[PDB]
């Protein structure tokens, strides 16, 4: 749970995220697996629990969502807690984007004065008891 | 330490989506 | 296939996801063919008459489920063992089956990729006519540092009349095989992201080929996300899973 408190290092990174060039990295091939460690899809319980750790310690709330930022979260959870990074998908716009993962208590709301559309992570415990994505789109579910 | 390596346990449902 | 009345003291399933890397590199250093050919191989030990479902991270499945923006595997030339219901795969992407007993192979698939070959081999070659020949080969592991190939064998042709072999190498072991008119460099354990050197000369057209196995690895990123089991009895059953990459057909042209 204290390694769950390597989150500031993740949150830090999550933030701040005749011509100059990107330093293309040298790619190493393949997808390793660490030997006996179970990999599973994200769970309602974990998603709820994670959710709450996050709303407490802060940094997710009203941070601005880009896929780049999203991804750093997902890998973090994949590497430390072993949940495949397919769970943090949201329902499509325009509008508020809803979690497809029941138990994940963040949604993506748009926003104007401070600036397709821009969004931020926002916490909603109602997401825990009301699977909004599923009724908006039972097509995705079963 | 075995064969083509050791197995990991797998999940029984897509807890990500219903179940 | 299935029969009734099967029974075990312990209910389990194992899945071996096995990927075979095909390669053709033309003599020049440019790649003709890069391909993954996979199969999922299952040991089933399940009492009664259960009902199985296999979640993979399947590009389509994700695309249809609003999960498209996730990393997946877009997987071609898919063909299934018999017991799999297609009517379900056709519409849902769902892999639904009543499994046979014990060993059998659930599915196969193919992939195309231009991506660094796992093991790269350059052999330079200096020949003095009717006098002597020299081989400087460098093996380079291009996969992740934290993985490791096994029982890697590099097969290089030498001429059917060459004699008096001599070689040096920092890692592994080299031998002459006259009957195949080849020398064989064998590295037992081959960590990723490494370059090894072997030197050979003799005295006085088939491709260089390699053989390797990599446990706890895939080149495709294929995840088996879950395996669902339903049987009428309250059933405690556990699935197990491993990934193994191996060579299948892997060759550098020589000329």
Closest by CA position to C63, among listed A98, A92, B13, A66: A92
Does residue C122 contact residue C47 with C-beta atoms inside 8 Å? Answer: no
Distance CA A125, CA B5 (A): 42
Residue ranges in chain C assigned as alpha helix (H): 59-64, 86-92
What's the token pair of residue C252?
Answer: 């550098």
Closest chain A residue to B5, measured at CA:
A35
Backbone angles phi, psi at C90, to 5 degrees: -55, -55
Distance CA C223, CA C56 (A): 6
A61: CB partners within 8 A, 6+ apart: A55, A120, A121, A122, A123
Provide the CB-side half-sphere exposure for C13 (13 A, CA).
32
Contact A36 B10 (CB under 8 A): no
Distance CA A35, CA C215 (A): 9
C73: CB partners within 8 A, 6+ apart: C56, C57, C58, C59, C111, C220, C221, C222, C223
Q: Is the peptide bond before C47 cis (omega within 30 degrees of 0)?
A: no
Which one of A36, A37, A101 has the shortest CB-CB distance to B16?
A101
Q: What's the 3-state SS for A98-137?
A: CECCCCCCEEEEECCCCCCCCEEEEECHHHHCCCHHHHHC
Q: Provide the terminal-to-terminal Cα distance of chain B, rounded to the nearest Å.
A: 34
Strands B8-9, C237-246: pairing kind: antiparallel
Helix (H) or strand (E) holding A15: none
C152: CB partners within 8 A, 6+ apart: C119, C139, C186, C187, C188, C190, C210, C211, C212, C213
- Pick among 2.60.40.1170, 1.10.3720.10, 3.30.830.10, 1.10.340.30: CATH of C117-213+250-255: 2.60.40.1170
- Residues in chain C, overall count: 255
Which one of A28, A84, A91 has the shortest CB-CB distance to C142?
A28
Q: Tokens 């926002």 label which residue?
A: A122
Distance CA C245, CA C149 (A): 9
The total of other beta-carbon atoms located within 10 Å of residue C137's CB is 22
The two counts, helices (H) then strands (E), for chain C are 2, 18
Rounded to the nearest 10 degrees, what angle do helices A67-81 and A44-57 cross at? 120
What's the token pair of residue C10?
Answer: 């312990």
Cα dist from C197 to C119, C138, C171, whole Å: 13, 5, 7
Closest chain A residue to C145, measured at CA:
A28
Backbone angles phi, psi at C62, to 5 degrees: -65, -45
Chain A contact present for C247, CB below 8 A: no
Chain A contact present for C114, CB below 8 A: no
**Biggest alpha carbon distance in chain B?**
36
Domain boundaries in chain A?
A: 1-142
Which one of A33, A100, A133 has the shortest CB-CB distance to C217?
A33
Distance CA A40, CA C228 (A): 12
Picking from B4, B8, B9, B15 by the largest number of C CB atoms within 10 A of its own CB, the best residue to mutate is B4
Q: What would the DSSP string read from start to end of C104-150? A: EEEEEEEEE--S--SEEEEEEEEEETTTEEEEEEEEEE-B-TT-EEE
Picking from C15, C66, C114 by the largest number of A CB atoms within 10 A of its own CB, the best residue to mutate is C66
Distance CA C100, CA C1 (A): 4
What's the token pair of residue A36?
Answer: 């006996």
Distance CA A10, CA A16 (A): 11
Write out the CATH class of domain A1-142.
Answer: alpha beta
Picking from A26, A27, A33, A87 by the largest number of C CB atoms within 10 A of its own CB, the best residue to mutate is A33
Angle at C14 between CA C9 and CA C19, to 5 degrees: 165
Chain A contact present for B6, CB below 8 A: yes
Q: Which fold has domain C1-116+214-249?
A: Immunoglobulin-like (2.60.40)
Chain C contact present for B2, CB below 8 A: no
Helix (H) or strand (E) holding C240: strand C237-246
Cα of B2 to nearest chain C Cα, Å:
10
Distance CA C175, CA C166 (A): 9
Closest chain C residue to B12, measured at CA:
C228
Question: Hey, is C35 helix, strand or coil?
Answer: strand
Distance CA A23, CA C20 (A): 32
Domain boundaries in chain C?
A: 1-116+214-249, 117-213+250-255
Q: Which residues of C touch B4 (CB under 8 A)?
A: 16, 18, 213, 215, 242, 244
What's the token pair of residue C248?
Answer: 């299948």
Distance CA C117, CA C24 (A): 10
Q: Provide the terminal-to-terminal Cα distance of chain A, rounded to the nearest Å.
A: 32
Distance CA C155, CA A81 (A): 42
Closest by CA position to C172, among listed C191, C157, C145, C147: C191
Long-range contacts of A129-138 (CB under 8 A, 24+ apart): A131/A102, A132/A91, A132/A98, A132/A99, A132/A107, A133/A90, A133/A91, A133/A98, A133/A99, A133/A100, A133/A102, A133/C66, A134/A102, A134/B18, A136/A91, A136/A98, A137/A91, A137/C66
Q: What would the DSSP string read from start to end of C192-214? A: SSEEEEEEEE----PPEEEEEEE
Closest by CA position to C176, among listed C196, C156, C199, C152: C156
Residue A113, class by beta-carbon neighbours within 10 Å (0-12 exposed, 13-18 middle, 19+ buried)?
Answer: exposed
Distance CA C68, CA C100 (A): 33
Does residue C190 contact residue C229 with C-beta atoms inside 8 Å? Answer: no
Picking from A32, A34, A39, A41 by the largest number of B CB atoms within 10 A of its own CB, the best residue to mutate is A41
Distance CA C15, CA C20 (A): 16
What's the resolution in A?
2.9
Contact C57 A34 (CB under 8 A): no
Distance CA B13, CA C4 (A): 25
Contact B11 A40 (CB under 8 A): yes
């Amino acid at each position: 749970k204290s390694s769950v408190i390597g989150w500031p290092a993740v949150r830090e990174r999550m933030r701040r995220a005749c011509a100059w060039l990107e330093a293309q990295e040298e790619e190493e091939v393949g997808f390793p697996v660490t030997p006996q460690v179970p990999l599973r899809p994200m769970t309602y319980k974990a998603a709820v629990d994670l959710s709450h750790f996050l709303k407490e310690k802060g940094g997710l709330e009203g941070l601005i969502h880009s896929q780049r930022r999203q991804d750093i979260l997902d890998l973090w959870i994949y590497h430390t807690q072993g949940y495949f990074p397919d769970w943090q998908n949201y329902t499509p716009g325009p509008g508020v984007r809803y979690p497809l993962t029941f138990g994940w208590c963040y949604k993506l709301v748009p926003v104007e004065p401070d600036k397709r559309e821009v969004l931020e992570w926002r916490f909603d415990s109602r997401l825990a008891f009301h699977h909004v994505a599923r009724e908006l789109h039972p097509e995705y579910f079963k | 330490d075995r064969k083509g390596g050791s197995y990991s346990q797998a999940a029984g449902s897509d807890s990500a989506q219903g179940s | 296939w299935r029969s009734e009345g099967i029974k075990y003291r312990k209910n389990e399933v194992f899945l071996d996801v096995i990927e075979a890397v095909n390669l053709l590199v033309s003599a020049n250093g440019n790649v003709l063919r890069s391909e993954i050919v996979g199969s999922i191989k299952m040991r089933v030990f399940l009492s009664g008459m259960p009902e199985l479902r296999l979640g993979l991270n399947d590009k389509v499945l994700f695309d249809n489920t609003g999960r498209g923006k996730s990393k997946s595997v877009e997987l071609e030339d898919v063909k299934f063992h018999q017991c799999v219901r297609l009517s379900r795969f056709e519409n849902d992407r769902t892999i639904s089956f009543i499994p046979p007993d014990g060993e059998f192979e659930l599915m196969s698939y193919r992939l195309n990729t231009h991506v660094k070959p796992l093991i790269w081999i350059e052999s330079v070659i200096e020949k003095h006519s009717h006098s002597r020949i020299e081989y400087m080969v460098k093996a380079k592991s291009q996969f992740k540092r934290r993985s490791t190939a096994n029982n890697v064998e590099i097969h290089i042709p030498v001429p059917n009349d060459a004699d008096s072999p001599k070689f040096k190498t920092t890692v592994g072991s080299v031998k002459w095989v006259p009957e195949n008119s080849e020398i064989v460099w064998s590295v037992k354990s081959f960590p990723g992201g490494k370059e090894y050197l072997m030197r050979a000369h003799f005295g006085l057209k088939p491709p260089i080929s390699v053989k390797f196995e990599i446990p706890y690895f895939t080149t495709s990123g294929i995840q088996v996300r879950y395996l669902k089991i339903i049987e009428k009895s309250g059933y405690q059953a556990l699935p197990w899973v491993r990934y193994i990459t191996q060579n299948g057909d892997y060759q550098l042209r020589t000329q």
